[PDB]
Amino acid sequence: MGVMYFKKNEFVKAKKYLKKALEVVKDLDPSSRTTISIQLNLGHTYRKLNENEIAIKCFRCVLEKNDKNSEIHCSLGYLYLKTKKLQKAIDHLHKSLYLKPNNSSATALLKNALELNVTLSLD
Amino acid sequence: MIRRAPTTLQLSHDDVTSLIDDLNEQKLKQQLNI
Amino acid sequence: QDKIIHDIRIQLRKAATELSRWKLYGSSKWAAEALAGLAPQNGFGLSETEYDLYLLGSTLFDAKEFDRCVFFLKDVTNPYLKFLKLYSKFLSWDKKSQESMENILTTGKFTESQSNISSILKEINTFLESYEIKIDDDEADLGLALLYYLRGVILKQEKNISKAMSSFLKSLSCYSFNWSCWLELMDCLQKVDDALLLNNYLYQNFQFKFSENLGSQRTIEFNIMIKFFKLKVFEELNGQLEDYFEDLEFLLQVFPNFTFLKAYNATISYNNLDYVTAESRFDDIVKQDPYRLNDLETYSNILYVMQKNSKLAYLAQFVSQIDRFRPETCCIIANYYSARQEHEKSIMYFRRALTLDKKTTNAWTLMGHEFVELSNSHAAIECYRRAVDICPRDFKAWFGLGQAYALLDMHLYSLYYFQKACTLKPWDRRIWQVLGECYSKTGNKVEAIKCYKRSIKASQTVDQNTSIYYRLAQLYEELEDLQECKKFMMKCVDVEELLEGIVTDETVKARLWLAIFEIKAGNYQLAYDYAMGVSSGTSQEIEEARMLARECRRHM
């Protein structure tokens, strides 16, 4: 239901239903494609809602739950490039490309971060 | 009875291209000020 | 000293035995070896029905039958015998836990994944949560620290560094005098400013469990190895040292003829690039402990710089005589083949050494350098990557990537790699200059100067600054600062006087440009003076200088 209401670009009822689902399943399903799926979907909805802070926190907790995932790294890098934290995002892009060969969108994102690093002149 | 993977969506191409275009915008305007 | 050294002996004797008892080879080896350099208390919480399993578990582990031991301790409620099973369970997974890409280089064969430890991590959390006494208060004992230490190391596996330090520091508060625990703590830093923050935590927030420890050891500054902790951190990365020299002297007075200190003490010279003193400091330790093989590869590395191949070969012959499959033994041999310009074969021996530990000292990096001479430029770059993820504190690993990407047409990826290594070792004169040279492609000429000017200051010797002086003028030429081009280009002319008139090609271009510039400024007599200064070089510079000299005279 949350995935659908995200598809219809409502971005509100999707979040509410997804939060209800996770609050139902706080105790159980610590792993096995259930908690990770719902949490990543909620974080992606928060990203679409431009609320990036709890987005960062939830993406971080998902990543610490499971490390080997290209999508989690790519989305966390997207979140960081939304802000100005290039130093902490290009490593994540590095890891995402390391995990999965192509990641064309991730390749473009990392390239852009490259021209940013050229552009910036931080001490 | 078995459950399959629940539907999950990642960053699309349209939104990342929107971000790349915007990010070119703020890597392009500021050096004019400089 | 007085009773302080005596109090160490008794408690250090402990740290040698129980660590060996519950199968921690690495920690017990350091502690027991410390007994020799230093100038049967028994006890454990066990029942007769349970003591038997410990004998069963321990000897199966000794026979290296790891996986059977896990089954035979399936249901154990002992506070710390459970550690032995999980330790066996963890290693059974590890040996088959080889990443596919690294494995191709690890072997060259060219041909459930990680969920076990997730269960392992959940098991340890479940056990401690349900355990009778937590870590708080004066409760807990030696075995509890092992559980947290095992919990800490597994946390590092999923790159959960932030929580990893909490577990490790927690484990060590309960029990100290475990060397192996602090070794893993080192890999948790990967940064410089956190070290002092971690140091502040130790000085103020950290506290010891005096219940287990002996007298004069709960206090941090009376502890002897917190000095060892401080020694290791300030050698892996210099940064800003605090009481480094003063504390080093005290620990030298105690522990006479301790090989490990001398190796570390001598290793400091290598970090300081004082090769002549380093060999002498290595040479004695060979005489004292010929059969000690740890950190002899460093002795090989310095000999590689000195290119004393005759000396190195006997070292290689001597080392291989007494053991042929220890990681340093293969490492030194692969270094030897490099001296013989046989770069194609040094890979093979480095490959053999790598499979022994797969987390060694900077042996991954040396493997990459040999590929560079083979012009592979693609094995080496991904090779240099493997050093990064294992040890992100390695200067050479980061440098190799930037250096290799410099040969690649794109230079953009190289800037970031050099930036990280710049933070790691800002003291190096080469890195700042190389970074500035690559940074010129960016077109942000302003930032390169700040890098370029720092390179010159850090370059010490002025003779080598002549080449980089010309680079300053070239970049300033891109800006409306042609006067600034002259003031630094006249500096490299001045260095020629300091360099006894080496009149190299670098100042040849410098001298001719000044004459042309002064001719454009109308100073014919001044430009005529530098016209005869170009008395050597290629023919084109000679004829141009004479043309300048001829033109200057006509205007006088």
Side-chain angles (χ1 to χ4, degrees), chain A residues 1 3 6 9 12 17 44 76-78 82 103 112 115 117:
Chain A
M1 211 85 88
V3 162
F6 178 50
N9 310 89
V12 178
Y17 285 131
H44 193 193
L76 204 42
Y78 190 94
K82 201 166 295 296
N103 307 149
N112 201 348
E115 292 84 4
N117 178 57

Side-chain angles (χ1 to χ4, degrees), chain A residues 64 67-68 90 94-95 98 110 114 117-118 120-121, chain C residues 99 113 158-159 385 412-413 416 419 442 444 447:
Chain A
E64 63 86 20
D67 208 304
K68 53 176 183 178
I90 62 170
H94 181 74
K95 196 157 262 172
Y98 174 36
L110 183 62
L114 268 50
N117 178 57
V118 175
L120 61 83
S121 166
Chain C
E99 209 156 359
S113 179
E158 74 269 14
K159 330 306 176 60
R385 300 292 179 90
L412 164 52
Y413 281 120
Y416 162 53
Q419 285 178 356
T442 69
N444 296 115
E447 197 275 333

Side-chain angles (χ1 to χ4, degrees), chain C residues 23-42:
Chain C
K23 304 290 100 175
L24 282 72
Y25 302 148
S27 52
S28 176
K29 193 177 81 173
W30 190 68
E33 189 268 328
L35 272 298
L38 182 62
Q41 297 180 332
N42 52 5

Side-chain angles (χ1 to χ4, degrees), chain C residues 191-207:
Chain C
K191 182 62 65 68
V192 58
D193 50 13
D194 55 350
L196 61 83
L197 294 176
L198 190 149
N199 195 30
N200 280 352
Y201 190 93
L202 281 157
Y203 282 140
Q204 274 90 20
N205 307 118
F206 195 91
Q207 191 57 60

